Structures are given as C-alpha cells and as structure tokens.
Amino acid sequence: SEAQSRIQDADYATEVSNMSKAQIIQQAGNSVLAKANQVPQQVLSLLQ
Amino acid sequence: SEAQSRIQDADYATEVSNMSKAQIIQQAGNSVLAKANQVPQQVLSLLQ
C-alpha cells in the first residue's frame, strides 16, 4: 500500500500551486484578450 | 510434582512485569496513532 501510494497520489501541495498559477494565467489572458479587442477600435477615427 | 511445577508454571513474578509493559506499550501506541491521525489536517490550510 505504501508503494502504491507513491505511484498514484495527487500530492495536493504541488497541485494547489498549479491551480493558483492557472487561475492567474486565465485572468491575465482574458485581460490581454480584452486589450487586443480594443485595438481595432482606433481605425474608425481615421475615417473622419 | 516439583519437577512438573518447574515445567508448567507461569511464574507470575515475571509475568506481571510483562503485562504492565504490554499495557504501557499499548497506550503509547494508541497515543502515537492519534498523533499520526492528526497529521493530514494541514491539507485544508494548503487548499484555501
């Protein structure tokens, strides 16, 4: 059982760090996606 | 009869020490079992 533990065990200690990293990267990606989205807006100013 | 008593007699004097020792070891084992049980509690502290 001790040997089986090592092979298949989540080790939440490292998993929580990955979770927080992924959440931060998701929020950053959404924000930078928004910033890229306002980029097309400036073209309308050139029309007039 | 003396020879048989030599062969088959518990010799309570040494048996009482063994039984007291066994009780002490059992209580120590139960306490250390509880201490081991309390170990995985910090996983919540990690999670939140």
UniProtKB/Swiss-Prot annotation, chains A, B:
Task of the protein: Flagellin is the subunit protein which polymerizes to form the filaments of bacterial flagella.
Subcellular localization, as worded in the UniProt entry: Secreted; Bacterial flagellum
Homology family: Belongs to the bacterial flagellin family.
Annotated protein name in UniProt: Flagellin
Disulphide-bonded residues: none
